[PDB]
Design a binder for this molecule. Structure first.
Ligand code: CLA
Ligand code: CLA
Ligand code: CLA
Ligand code: CLA
Ligand code: CLA
Ligand code: CLA
Ligand code: CLA
Ligand code: CLA
Ligand SMILES: CC1=C(C#C/C(C)=C/C=C/C(C)=C/C=C/C=C(C)/C=C/C=C(\C)C#CC2=C(C)C[C@@H](O)CC2(C)C)C(C)(C)C[C@H](O)C1
Ligand SMILES: CC1=C(C#C/C(C)=C/C=C/C(C)=C/C=C/C=C(C)/C=C/C=C(C)/C=C/C2=C(C)CCCC2(C)C)C(C)(C)C[C@H](O)C1
Ligand SMILES: CC1=C(C/C=C(\C)CCC[C@H](C)CCC[C@H](C)CCCC(C)C)C(=O)c2ccccc2C1=O
Lengths: 69, 170, 151, 742, 42, 129
């Protein structure tokens, strides 16, 4: 079984990082919608944090698997 | 615009107060889908069954016929399932309900009020005004007895005491 | 960029120019092949095709034939290949007789004389190729086995 | 907000008037019958909605309400299976002793001596043995009571009433407009996220909270009435944490992403449960939870009302290369304006999924005690092969209907359809060649082996003892899947299926699953499969590609999808329609699926199913005769059909005598079909003329003039009786054989 | 009762299924009470 | 319109109906007001013969929570009819006062339940200790 850990500030760091990474990515790549103050709506934010949680969870589970944590 | 009973709900389109006992109460919108005539047929039939049953409870605790064993009304349901008198009552109800099917066809064809069987042997209804007053009373009693019989059977299921003995005890 | 076009710049012809049908590699291979080679005599066309076909016919008859487990497997395989060559050369002969009306010109396969020259070349090539396969398999032990001689 | 709900209110009046006028839906049929052909033409075109109305809106409304009617029928059917399990079954007796009691949920009335069909299935019970696998489903659900089966029957009944109400409501009260139906992005988002995703999520939740505790208690050995009721696991988290100690921590490990705490009940074990011979339900719970996450995530792909998402039109129009012209341009317009194009795709996919279901369910038995209930394993494999094959041929049927009717060349210039129709001779000629090559090199190997074995030349055969056609690629893939646990699936503990190699799983001394070795006979029958699938594709594809026109008939689209011919000229154009290729390909589907179920039945009896003796020896049902006898046709005739038809033929006077009767009855129906298949309408019309004369003589001629069936209907009736007869023969043969011996 | 629903119940498949179910039903009932009638008893 | 401090930083009002949002806010307000008044009341006094979250768990066994759920569910079904109809189709000061007090009670109850998770104490107990 892959080794996962209880929540720590490092897990929080990975989630926060992945979320911000996806906010910036969503500002660049979402085709239908002041770098972040132009056309930034709730759907765009909600979609990017949805992916940020998907990417963050995948990253946390993988970095816990390999030992990086 | 809005319902007399529920102030914040709008009055159902099919409920115009033509049927006595109407207060606009139909939130789930069963009258927007189904024929109100059929629904008033069903309301009065369920209520008349319930009124006869609540009097059925009360009299059956107070008295029972000497040829039948003394026992509780739900036990009476099971005894008359196994004895044959339940099948008798079911047959005669079903026999009357055949002409009830004919009566409901008369209602659907527009030629009969939903609860009218012209059953006034004792001539208690004198004119239209008292008939309307009695009719509102009948629907109110019908609805109240539907809730009451559910209470009597459910209370017996929870506490194995009859309605008169449950008032007498506790 | 479109890699499929109408064949011969004619849209209503019943073919499509495609990479498989009309690449330069396909055109080079067909032209190089003896049947379509320019400058090749019909007899010479038959000799090259025959040498090829007779050479590879011996192997399935030899390796998978009824007499394969016998020591006469190669002789049986050659004879079976030779018999198939004689049946096929009869087929070539009868096709030539019925298909082509007799004409003086022999420079093409699609002529009575040209198909007769082709059949002549195919028989000589096929018997020679079958014989060449027999000589090679008999001499080389590895060819006698299925490649398991090393094992 | 361009994705919106739009409905016409009270479109169609709920009246019995059109019920009383049969044929009301078409202008041809509404003027009444003059010949008996009208009667047949009534049923033949009833569900052909786009033949009655021009408007796509009324067509879509009719389809939506007919889908609710179908769902109502399925829910009524399910409610009946639950009620027959509750009332007319030995389910409670089967729960106590799953390996000895035979499932039975059907009891016959004693009327004409037919009460012999109430055989002794076990558990103090007499009834017809049932093979649908419902008992194993219910044990997997954790039902453990007939009362809960009554509640499931009522839940099915309520759903059946709600679907028939919804079909009435959505046709007659609030029918959606066409712009509602043409929301493929919204529908896909909801059917991936909501239908499949919350379906898996809710089912995984049920498995974790109900199936897992009840089945752990059942496999521990606790009697079904000693097991706590399924809500007592929901409330008493302490009692649930006894069985699975991870429940002591609750939902904090889920949200904090500490998911390895849940490894008690969300496993990746693989293999089978040794007690039941079924899949580990902890694996199934993890499986459904993982599918739920991806299905919900997938249902966020498409753009609906907020700018995030894909336009499927943009995805399709961007995929074009140098070989394929304009590419997938115009396919979105097709699939949101043609119902038949959607039905062609979805029927081919539903059939493919049903075929995948049959292979995966036998190999990885998913229910407790289903692997060693061999009548159920054979029944559900054979059933889902037939549902798969039928649905695949209906995918080609509605591809033909799309091509004949909904295809417009103006909107399909130089796209993928245009290019396929413009090289259909190359497609059909190469498919024709591969089918000839593969009939020669699969069935001709059988003819070679028949000949050599008949000639005394056993050294000249394709066999394991002679020339060995080994399936090296299939054996190699089996090697990889046996080596996969700990190597390429490191966190797996066992193989995905024991069919690939590994242990023999035995339950109640009967083999649940065991390695299926592949030899020369398996190479030969798999290339038989590749051949029969290829030829069925050739007939169905040749019908789709040549539905609109040929070199033979240049205006075939003007004759329609379903026409009998265009006369005896051009040499004869009998069966030139796309319909007649569906007609001819349903025979080849029948041929394909019949060989698949025969291969499965013989291979599982010969090499998988049987009893485990002391020292782990497995005595198989037909004793390993597949390897040396499935290489000849005489072996299939002798050692499979003749040897195993013993049970149907000798079933009279027993509980399996119904199978003997259906065996004979279906041989009858199959033969009776050939009257419609080998004959033509003109014979029967002249014979009917003489019979009409005999009626005229007695002044008893009918006013609806009797006609011989149409040419197409004679073909359809012949095919329907042929399929019923063949499949019913195989159904009776399979079921009596495996109920007796397995 | 509605005349169009009665005209629907007068249609050929409904009457055929009801009449042959009634026919089947009294063959079943006659073979229930009086089974095994291979002959007219005399 | 009531309780409008111009506070919609994520702009929820742009992407959901202001009537559905206001119904949710007012229903959350009222429920939270009853809940917050309830939290302090349980510690202050107990109805004769009778924990922020554990008492809920005890009550479901006694059926006290179950009876409350059924009756609240019936009123809520009528409320669902009201919400659908609203979406389909002195006192001013009091509406603002109800919204502000309800928002304060939402935070209030939220504080009380997290206080219970922390010290295992009721809100009056938190003031006492
Ligand atoms: C949907 C699936 C399904 C299936 C295949 C069956 C099949 C069966 N059931 Mg089960 N059943 C089901 C659902 C199902 N049932 C459901 C949902 C319930 C709960 C209500 C039941 C409850 C039930 C009981 C309680 C019993 C059965 C029994 C039976 C058996 C005989 C029934 C019979 O002869 O009726 C024949 C009854 C007739 C009245 C004859 C039918 C003739 C008429 C004309 C039918 C025509 C339909 C009509 C023409 C359609 C058009 C309508 C009209 C307006 C035109 C048979 C094995 C019996 C059994 O197993 O005994 C051991 C039994 O006692 N069933
Ligand atoms: C998330 C929402 C959702 C869900 C669950 C469904 C579900 C379904 N749709 Mg779809 N649909 C949706 C949104 C949704 N749709 C939208 C937004 C549109 C507009 C673009 C459509 C347009 C559409 C069309 C045009 C068609 C469907 C069809 C179907 C049915 C497919 C047959 C099947 O597998 O049913 C069996 C599976 C089931 C689960 C049966 C359950 C039935 C109910 C309706 C499921 C949901 C119940 C409820 C939400 C669950 C509450 C849970 C509670 C107990 C806690 C299925 C009931 C087809 C159909 O058969 O029509 C009836 C069809 O033709 N839908
Ligand atoms: C940088 C962080 C990070 C790291 C170290 C990993 C590392 C890993 N991931 Mg993760 N993953 C990441 C980010 C990361 N991923 C992100 C951003 C996503 C998107 C959400 C995923 C989604 C993902 C899924 C969905 C899965 C993994 C799995 C895995 C493991 C199996 C890889 C393998 O060899 O399978 C080889 C697989 C083959 C088919 C070989 C061919 C591997 C340890 C898998 C696993 O085992 O999880 C435990 C798994 O199921 N990853
Ligand atoms: C007038 C028509 C009629 C007839 C002939 C019967 C006949 C019968 N009823 Mg029924 N019954 C009827 C109308 C009728 N019923 C009606 C209209 C009702 C009201 C719904 C009932 C309610 C009913 C009940 C509740 C019972 C009977 C019972 C009986 C049986 C009585 C046994 C007996 O003779 O000793 C009794 C003799 C006398 C009472 C003498 C007077 C007999 C089968 C009883 C029984 O045992 O059934 C098996 C039973 O319990 N009947
Ligand atoms: C749609 C499916 C579905 C549904 C309706 C539920 C519903 C519930 N789950 Mg389950 N659960 C599900 C899917 C589902 N779950 C899945 C997919 C998993 C795997 C990740 C779990 C794993 C899980 C665990 C491990 C636990 C629950 C618990 C609960 C209960 C919540 C009580 C609580 O917050 O204590 C949570 C406790 C905390 C300390 C926080 C509730 C009855 C809890 C419970 O009462 O178990 C019976 C509990 O301990 N669930
Ligand atoms: C989701 C599945 C689905 C759907 C919605 C449709 C829908 C449609 N199909 Mg398609 N089709 C399907 C599956 C489907 N089919 C499959 C699986 C096949 C392969 C067999 C076909 C083959 C097919 C052809 C070849 C044709 C259609 C046609 C039609 C249309 C009208 C059919 C009609 O009125 O028949 C009304 C229904 C009947 C006449 C029922 C009779 C069918 C059999 C004989 C009854 C089965 C009885 C039972 C199962 C076994 C007998 C038991 C016995 C012992 C009593 C309609 C658009 C026809 C059409 O008009 O094209 C536009 C047409 O030509 N389809
Ligand atoms: C058992 C009976 C039988 C046989 C042998 C065939 C044979 C064939 N069918 Mg037919 N078919 C049959 C029944 C049969 N069909 C029935 C009942 C239907 C009902 C609908 C159809 C409908 C049908 C359609 C609709 C299609 C076929 C196709 C085919 C061909 C498949 C390609 C192939 O395998 O070539 C290999 C040839 C064989 C397997 C024949 C057996 C030969 C064996 C191997 C030995 C050869 C003997 C050898 C020549 C001896 C020479 C010496 C001698 C001459 C003296 C082939 C000609 C397809 C086709 O032609 O396209 C490719 C096609 O599309 N069939
Ligand atoms: C509005 C709510 C409410 C009200 C008015 C009451 C009122 C009462 N309860 Mg009830 N009770 C409640 C909620 C309530 N309780 C709740 C939430 C529970 C938990 C489920 C209980 C459980 C409960 C039990 C178990 C018992 C009572 C009892 C009593 C009576 C005690 C008289 C007493 O000491 O008064 C003050 C009296 C004096 C100071 C002098 C005399 C009284 C009539 C007792 C009783 O009499 O019931 C038969 C009893 O045994 N109650
Ligand atoms: C067996 C036996 C005997 C007997 C007996 C008999 C025959 C007893 C018959 C009993 C009957 C028929 C009871 C009928 C109950 C109906 C009810 C309670 C309806 C509730 C509906 C509600 C509250 C509503 C509503 C709705 C409205 C209107 C508007 C909607 O938009 C919304 C909404 C859904 C809210 C007796 C007892 C004498 C004793 C004997 O020894 C044995
Ligand atoms: C099983 C079985 C048996 C049986 C039986 C029978 C006949 C059982 C009958 C059960 C019944 C009638 C249940 C219904 C009760 C009424 C309810 C719940 C409505 C309450 C009012 C509500 C919710 C709201 C009211 C509202 C409020 C707030 C106040 C204002 C009004 C309103 C707005 C409407 C036997 C005896 C035959 C024995 C045998 O063993 C078989
Ligand atoms: C027998 C036969 C007929 C005559 C068959 C007819 C006229 C069918 C009439 C049978 C009776 C009248 C009704 C059939 C009823 C069955 C007992 C069951 C039918 C089940 C469904 C029809 C409901 C054809 O018309 C025909 C046409 C083209 C190719 C082959 C044939 C063919 O073989």
């Amino acid at each position: 079984v892959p080794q996962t850990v209880a929540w720590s500030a490092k897990t929080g760091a990975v989630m926060v990082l992945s979320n911000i990474l996806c906010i910036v990515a969503g500002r660049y790549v979402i085709q239908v919608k002041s770098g972040s103050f132009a056309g930034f709506g709730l759907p765009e934010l909600l979609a990017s944090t949805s992916l940020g949680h998907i990417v963050g969870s995948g990253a946390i589970l993988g970095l816990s698997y390999v030992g990086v944590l | 615009d809005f319902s007399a009973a529920v102030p914040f709900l709008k009055r159902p389109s099919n409920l115009d107060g033509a049927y006595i006992g109407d207060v606009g109460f139909d939130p789930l919108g069963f009258s927007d889908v189904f024929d109100l005539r059929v629904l008033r047929e069903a309301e009065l039939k369920h209520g008349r069954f319930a009124m006869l049953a609540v009097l059925g409870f009360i009299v059956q605790e107070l008295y029972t016929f000497p040829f039948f064993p003394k026992m509780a009304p739900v036990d009476a349901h099971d005894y008359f399932v196994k004895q044959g008198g339940g099948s008798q009552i079911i047959f005669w109800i079903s026999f009357v309900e055949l002409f009830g099917v004919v009566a409901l066809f008369e209602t659907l064809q527009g030629k009969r009020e939903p609860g009218d069987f012209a059953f006034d042997p004792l001539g208690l209804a004198k004119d239209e005004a008292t008939l309307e007053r009695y009719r509102l009373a009948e629907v109110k009693h019908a609805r109240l007895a539907m809730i009451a019989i559910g209470g009597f059977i459910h209370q017996y299921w929870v506490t194995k005491q009859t309605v008169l003995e449950q008032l007498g005890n506790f | 960029s479109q890699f499929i076009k109408p064949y011969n710049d004619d849209p209503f012809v019943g073919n499509l120019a495609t990479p498989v049908s009309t690449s330069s590699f396909t055109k080079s291979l067909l032209s190089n092949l003896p049947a379509y080679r320019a400058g090749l005599s019909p007899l010479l066309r038959g000799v090259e095709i025959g040498l090829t076909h007779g050479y590879f016919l011996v192997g399935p008859f030899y390796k998978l034939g009824p007499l394969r487990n016998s020591d006469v497997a190669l002789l049986s395989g050659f004879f079976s290949a030779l018999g198939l060559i004689v049946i096929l050369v009869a087929c070539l002969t009868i096709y030539g007789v019925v298909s082509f009306e007799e004409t003086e010109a022999k420079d093409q396969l699609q002529t009575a004389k040209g198909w007769r020259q082709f059949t002549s070349g195919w028989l000589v090539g096929s018997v020679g190729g079958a014989s060449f396969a027999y000589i090679l398999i008999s001499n080389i032990p590895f060819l006698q086995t299925a490649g398991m001689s090393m094992l | 907000k361009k994705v919106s709900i739009t409905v016409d209110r009270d479109p169609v009046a709920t009246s019995f008037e059109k019920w009383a006028q049969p044929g009301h839906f078409s202008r041809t049929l509404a003027k009444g019958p003059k010949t008996t052909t009208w009667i047949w033409n009534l049923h033949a075109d009833v569900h052909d909605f786009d033949s009655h109305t021009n408007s796509l809106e009324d067509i879509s409304r009719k389809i939506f309400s007919a889908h609710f009617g179908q769902l109502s029928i399925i829910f009524l059917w399910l409610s009946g299976m639950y009620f027959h399990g509750a009332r007319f079954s030995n389910y409670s007796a089967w729960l106590s002793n799953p390996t000895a009691v035979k499932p039975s949920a059907q009891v016959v009335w004693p009327i004409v001596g037919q009460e012999v069909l109430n055989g002794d299935v076990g558990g103090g019970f007499q009834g017809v043995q049932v093979t649908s696998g419902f008992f194993q489903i219910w044990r997997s659900s954790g039902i453990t009571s007939e009362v809960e089966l009554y509640w499931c029957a009522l839940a099915g009944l309520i759903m059946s009433g709600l679907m028939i109400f919804a079909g009435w409501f959505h046709y007659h009260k609030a029918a959606p407009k066409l712009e509602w139906f043409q929301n493929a992005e919204s529908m896909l988002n909801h059917h991936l996220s909501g239908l499949l995703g919350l379906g898996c999520l809710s089912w995984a939740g049920h498995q974790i909270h109900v199936s897992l505790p009840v089945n752990k208690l059942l496999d521990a050995g606790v009697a079904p009435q000693e097991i706590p009721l399924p809500h007592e696991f929901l409330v008493n988290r302490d009692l649930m944490a006894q069985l699975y100690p991870s429940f002591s921590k609750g939902l904090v490990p889920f949200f904090t992403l500490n998911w390895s705490e849940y490894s008690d009940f969300l496993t990746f074990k693989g293999g089978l449960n040794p007690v039941t011979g079924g899949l580990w339900l902890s694996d199934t719970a993890h499986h459904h939870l993982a599918l739920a996450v991806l299905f919900i995530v997938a249902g966020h792909m498409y753009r609906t009302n907020w700018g995030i998402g894909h336009s499927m039109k943009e995805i399709l129009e961007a995929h074009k290369g140098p070989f394929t012209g304009e590419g997938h341009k115009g396919l979105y317009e097709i699939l949101t304006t043609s119902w038949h194009a959607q039905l062609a795709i979805n029927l081919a996919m539903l059939g493919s999924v049903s075929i995948i279901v049959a292979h995966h369910m036998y190999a990885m038995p998913p229910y407790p005690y289903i692997a060693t209930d061999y009548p159920t394993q054979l029944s559900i494999f054979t059933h889902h092969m037939w549902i798969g094959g039928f649905c695949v041929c209906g995918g080609a049927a509605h591809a033909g209907i799309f091509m004949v009717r909904d295809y417009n060349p103006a909107q399909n210039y130089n796209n993928l359809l245009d290019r396929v129709i413009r090289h259909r001779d190359a497609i059909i000629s190469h498919l024709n060649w591969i089918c000839i090559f593969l009939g020669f090199h699969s069935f001709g190997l059988y003819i070679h082996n028949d000949t050599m074995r008949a000639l005394g030349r056993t050294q000249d055969m394709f066999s394991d003892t002679a020339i060995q056609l080994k399936p090296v690629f299939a054996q190699w893939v089996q090697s990889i899947h046996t080596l996969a646990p700990g190597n390429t699936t490191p966190n797996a503990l066992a193989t995905a299926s024991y069919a690939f190699g590994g242990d023999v799983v035995a339950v109640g001394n009967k083999v649940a699953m065991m390695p299926i070795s592949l030899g020369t006979a398996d190479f030969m029958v798999h290339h038989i499969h590749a051949f029969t699938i290829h030829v069925t594709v050739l007939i169905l594809l040749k019908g789709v590609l040549f539905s609109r026109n040929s070199r033979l008939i240049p205006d075939k689209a003007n004759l329609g999808f379903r026409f009998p011919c265009d006369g005896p000229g051009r040499g004869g154009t009998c069966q030139s329609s796309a319909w007649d290729s569906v007609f001819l390909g349903l025979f080849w589907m029948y041929n394909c699926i019949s060989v698949v179920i025969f291969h499965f039945s013989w291979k599982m009896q010969s090499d998988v199913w049987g009893t485990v003796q002391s020292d782990g020896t497995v005595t198989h049902i037909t004793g390993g005769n597949f390897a040396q006898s499935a290489i000849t046709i005489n072996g299939w005739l002798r050692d499979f059909l003749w040897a195993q038809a013993s049970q149907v033929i000798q079933s009279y006077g027993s509980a399996l005598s119904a199978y003997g009767l259906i065996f004979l009855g279906a041989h009858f129906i199959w033969a009776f079909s050939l009257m419609f298949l080998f004959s033509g309408r003109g014979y029967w019309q002249e014979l009917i003329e003489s019979i009409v004369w005999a009626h005229n003589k007695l002044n008893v001629a009918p006013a609806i003039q009797p006609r011989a069936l149409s040419i197409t209907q004679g073909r359809a009736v012949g095919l329907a009786h042929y399929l019923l007869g063949g499949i019913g023969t195989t159904w009776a043969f399979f079921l009596a054989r495996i109920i007796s011996v397995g | 009762m509605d005349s169009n629903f009665l005209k629907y119940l007068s249609t050929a498949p409904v009457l055929f299924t009801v009449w042959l179910s009634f026919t089947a039903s009294f063959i079943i009932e006659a073979n229930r009470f009086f089974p095994d009638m291979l002959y007219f008893p005399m | 319109v009531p309780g409008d401090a111009g506070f919609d930083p994520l702009t929820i009002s742009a992407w959901l109906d202001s009537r559905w949002l206001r119904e949710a806010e007012i229903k959350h307000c009222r429920v939270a007001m009853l809940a917050a008044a309830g939290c302090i009341a349980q510690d202050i006094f107990q109805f004769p013969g009778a924990k922020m979250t554990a008492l809920h768990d005890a009550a479901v066994k006694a059926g006290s929570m179950g009876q409350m759920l059924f009756w609240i569910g019936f009123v809520e079904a009528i409320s669902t009819a009201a919400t659908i109809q609203m979406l389909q189709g002195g006192r001013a000061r009091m509406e603002l006062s109800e919204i502000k007090n309800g928002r304060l009670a939402m935070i209030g109850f939220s504080g009380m339940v997290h206080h219970y998770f922390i010290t295992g104490k009721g809100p009056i107990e938190l003031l006492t200790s």
